[PDB]
Amino acid sequence: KLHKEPATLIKAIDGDTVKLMYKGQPMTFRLLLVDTPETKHPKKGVEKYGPEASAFTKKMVENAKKIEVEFDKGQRTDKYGRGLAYIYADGKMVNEALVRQGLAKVAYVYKPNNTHEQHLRKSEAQAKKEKLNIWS
Template identity: 55%
Template sequence: MAQQQKKEQPKNLKQWIISIIVVAIAGYFGIDLLDSEDTKPSKEGLIPVELVRVVDGDTIRVKYEGEEKAVRYLLVDTPETVHPKKTTERFGPEASNFMKELMKDGKVEIEFDVGEKEDKYGRLLAYIYVDGESVQEMLLRKGLARVAFVYPPNDSYVTHFKEIEAEAKKNKCGIWSLEGYVHARGFDTERYPYDEKSKKDIQKVCD
């Protein structure tokens, strides 16, 4: 009996050592995999930029390749707040304030489409992301923007954006809560001027 126990001890010791090694290796690679997940980019093709300031709901200024540039969001249009030839439009302040709050502490990145990277005014044309999330999608989902200025070939996401817009319209979110406010050229400020009633617009923005 004693001899049998002595024979089993080396075997048990060997299994114990192997178990420790396996656990150690698994632990090592497990940590490494977690680190890789945390540091990998959220989406291919995104370019980090330094935010300078938010201009309005669909335009920001950033540092890009060492130069300060305006960036116009591709495929969306938000109501105006700073246009030199237009008055403030309803839901414009809500869109602008949403951008300021969203980008206050977030990591801002841009993505170019396959066409021209700049418009005739020298503004970059791009999709915007904050912490890996599409800003265009957020604006459309909340009812703070319409799909507009679709110029191929810079239209890779237009079908997807129109689906989000249709859902916001169905739910009467934001700009879609005012019947007839949105039209092909923008927003009807004669029928819906920016006035005291506009203070309640924030209540109509969807989450």
């Protein structure tokens, strides 16, 4: 059973990356299972909907009373040392909110880090059918 743990915002970095204080340590978190357009893209740079995805994540975490992180059942960090997690702002999953708004796509999935995959894919299908943002 996945469980939530408290964390404290340090800084939002991009639509898909936030820095948190977790168990007393500053750590960079990559949001599991989603890909947002990025502002800091290794190759392209500032893609379309990038600033928008990044403002959405920022606002959502900055205006929360409580931030919680939820690790999945597989690896908890990636090769860059970033935490891999579902992030919740007052009970609401940020990863899902992005996809529901057409501001992220469901990423390529790697088992067993895929507990909320079907739920995200259902929100993605609704945002596509609603032709929101990325899907417009």
